[PDB]
Symmetry: C2
Subunit: 93 residues, 2 copies
Amino acid sequence: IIGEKTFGKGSVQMLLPVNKDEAIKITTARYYLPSGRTIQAKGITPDIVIYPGKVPENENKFSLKVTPKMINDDIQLKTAIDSLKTWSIVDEK
Amino acid sequence: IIGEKTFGKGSVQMLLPVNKDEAIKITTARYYLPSGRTIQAKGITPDIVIYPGKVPENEVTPKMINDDIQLKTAIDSLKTWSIVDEK
């Protein structure tokens, strides 16, 4: 899991008939992860934190006058690729 | 292998004794990797390319990880290895 902390919305609601005049929507259940932790109080904390932006380049304005090169405009996407590249290396056993 | 492409110094020189008055140094052998490829022509191309610098943010080795983005990547590549080994 790469990126930032998520929003944390782990509730589900349901239409409850208060007779015929009124109806309420309230949380009828909450979500729990395979680890047992709940999702609403905290959300998901990723294994690798990387804030968005462009990929650095010591000569990024010297060079200045299907997912290639776009990886350079997205530092978060390039890191997930980097974790795949080490994963594919580890599976070479 | 994390970082940049290396320099590529895979040559070996040797002193050829022209008696006692002269000696020449010339490359007598080259280095070859376990894959058979030579070193000087290409060097080492890393698996993960990363230029050095600071890690962007959003506002004994702690804090330096932020001042060394290459080190943060090498740790991150270890962190996925520890996940795969969870079998």
